[PDB]
Coordinates of C-alpha atoms in Angstrom, one line a residue:
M1 CA 0.0 0.0 0.0
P2 CA 2.9 2.4 0.9
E3 CA 5.9 3.2 -1.3
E4 CA 7.9 0.0 -1.9
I5 CA 9.8 -1.0 1.2
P6 CA 12.2 2.0 1.5
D7 CA 15.6 1.8 3.1
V8 CA 16.4 4.4 5.8
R9 CA 13.2 6.5 6.4
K10 CA 13.0 10.2 7.3
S11 CA 12.3 12.4 10.4
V12 CA 9.4 14.6 11.3
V13 CA 8.7 17.3 13.9
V14 CA 5.4 17.0 16.0
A15 CA 3.9 19.1 18.7
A16 CA 4.2 16.9 21.8
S17 CA 6.4 16.7 24.9
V18 CA 9.2 14.2 24.9
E19 CA 7.6 12.4 27.9
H20 CA 4.4 12.1 25.8
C21 CA 6.3 10.3 23.0
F22 CA 7.4 7.4 25.2
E23 CA 4.2 7.7 27.4
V24 CA 1.8 7.6 24.4
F25 CA 3.1 4.3 23.1
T26 CA 2.7 2.8 26.6
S27 CA -0.4 4.9 27.4
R28 CA -2.8 3.4 24.8
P29 CA -1.8 3.3 21.1
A30 CA -5.4 2.2 20.3
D31 CA -6.3 5.9 20.6
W32 CA -5.0 6.3 17.1
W33 CA -4.1 2.8 15.9
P34 CA -7.3 2.6 13.8
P35 CA -7.3 5.1 10.8
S36 CA -10.3 4.1 8.7
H37 CA -10.1 0.6 7.1
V38 CA -7.9 -2.2 8.5
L39 CA -6.9 -5.4 6.7
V40 CA -7.2 -7.1 10.1
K41 CA -10.7 -8.8 10.4
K42 CA -11.1 -7.0 13.7
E43 CA -9.8 -3.5 14.5
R44 CA -7.3 -3.4 17.4
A45 CA -8.7 -1.9 20.6
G46 CA -6.7 -2.9 23.6
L47 CA -2.9 -3.0 23.9
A48 CA -0.5 -4.2 26.5
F49 CA 3.3 -4.9 26.2
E50 CA 6.3 -5.2 28.5
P51 CA 8.8 -2.5 27.4
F52 CA 12.3 -4.1 27.7
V53 CA 14.9 -5.9 25.5
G54 CA 13.4 -9.2 24.3
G55 CA 10.1 -8.2 25.9
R56 CA 6.7 -9.5 24.5
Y57 CA 4.2 -7.3 22.7
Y58 CA 0.5 -8.4 22.3
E59 CA -2.8 -6.7 21.6
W60 CA -6.5 -7.6 22.2
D61 CA -8.8 -7.8 19.2
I62 CA -12.5 -7.0 19.4
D63 CA -13.3 -10.7 19.0
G64 CA -9.8 -12.2 18.4
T65 CA -7.6 -13.3 21.2
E66 CA -4.1 -11.9 21.8
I67 CA -1.7 -11.7 18.7
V68 CA 1.9 -10.6 18.8
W69 CA 2.1 -7.2 17.0
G70 CA 5.9 -6.9 17.2
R71 CA 8.6 -6.9 19.9
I72 CA 11.1 -4.6 21.6
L73 CA 14.9 -3.8 21.2
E74 CA 15.9 -1.5 24.0
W75 CA 14.3 1.3 26.1
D76 CA 16.5 4.4 26.5
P77 CA 15.3 7.2 28.9
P78 CA 13.9 10.3 27.2
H79 CA 16.4 10.5 24.4
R80 CA 16.6 7.2 22.4
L81 CA 13.9 4.6 21.7
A82 CA 14.5 1.3 19.8
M83 CA 12.1 -1.6 19.3
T84 CA 12.2 -4.9 17.4
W85 CA 9.0 -5.9 15.6
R86 CA 8.2 -9.7 15.4
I87 CA 5.0 -10.5 13.5
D88 CA 3.9 -13.1 10.9
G89 CA 3.2 -12.1 7.3
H90 CA -0.3 -13.8 7.6
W91 CA -1.0 -11.7 10.7
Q92 CA -0.6 -15.0 12.6
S93 CA 2.2 -15.3 15.1
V94 CA 6.0 -15.7 15.3
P95 CA 7.1 -17.6 18.5
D96 CA 10.7 -16.9 17.4
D97 CA 12.5 -14.1 15.5
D98 CA 13.9 -15.9 12.4
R99 CA 14.2 -12.9 10.0
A100 CA 12.7 -10.2 12.2
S101 CA 14.1 -6.7 11.6
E102 CA 15.0 -3.9 14.1
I103 CA 13.7 -0.3 14.1
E104 CA 15.7 2.7 15.4
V105 CA 13.8 5.7 16.8
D106 CA 15.3 8.7 18.6
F107 CA 13.2 11.2 20.5
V108 CA 14.7 14.6 21.5
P109 CA 13.0 17.9 22.7
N110 CA 12.6 20.4 19.8
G111 CA 11.9 24.0 20.6
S112 CA 8.9 24.3 23.0
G113 CA 6.8 21.3 23.9
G114 CA 7.5 20.2 20.3
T115 CA 9.7 17.1 20.1
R116 CA 11.5 16.0 16.9
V117 CA 12.2 12.2 16.3
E118 CA 14.3 10.5 13.6
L119 CA 12.9 7.1 12.5
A120 CA 14.9 4.9 10.1
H121 CA 14.1 1.3 8.9
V122 CA 16.7 -1.0 7.3
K123 CA 16.7 -4.6 6.1
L124 CA 12.9 -4.8 6.9
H125 CA 12.4 -7.0 3.8
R126 CA 14.8 -9.5 5.3
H127 CA 11.6 -10.8 6.9
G128 CA 10.5 -12.0 3.4
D129 CA 7.8 -13.8 5.4
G130 CA 5.0 -11.6 4.1
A131 CA 5.5 -9.0 6.8
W132 CA 5.0 -6.4 4.0
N133 CA 1.3 -7.3 4.1
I134 CA 1.2 -6.3 7.8
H135 CA 2.6 -2.9 6.8
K136 CA -0.3 -2.4 4.4
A137 CA -2.8 -2.6 7.3
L138 CA -0.7 -0.2 9.4
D139 CA -0.5 2.0 6.3
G140 CA -3.6 4.2 6.5
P141 CA -4.6 7.3 4.4
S142 CA -1.8 9.4 3.1
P143 CA 0.9 6.6 3.0
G144 CA 4.4 7.6 4.3
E145 CA 7.0 6.9 7.0
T146 CA 5.5 5.8 10.3
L147 CA 6.2 9.3 11.7
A148 CA 3.8 10.7 9.0
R149 CA 0.7 8.8 10.3
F150 CA 1.9 9.1 13.9
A151 CA 2.4 12.9 13.6
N152 CA -1.0 13.4 11.9
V153 CA -2.9 11.5 14.6
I154 CA -0.7 13.0 17.3

């Protein structure tokens, strides 16, 4: 749905405190996880994950049980955020990371309550397990880097 799997992505500035950036992910991503149409049979509504290295990430579906939505890489206090995403191309589950890719995200205060973050993705295709289909569902209106949809809803 989005431009073909692009290598390093770009950065965007959004109006939000740095604490909000890390807090919003752990606060309740369901607040803006659903854009309009989702390939998932049921729209995600509840979310709960342990933020740590090798942590486990799962979400609750309106009628579906818990499915892994990704994983974690490392939590760095207000300044650097990194997370590994482990998911199946068929939106099923991946008990082990065989070809999972890592994501690098940095959050730093920009000007006033505005925070600027640089998000880059590399070797995401290494998954070659159909993970691209998962991105299509996450890709909502106005396709673009994750910061694009995140900044608009934020």
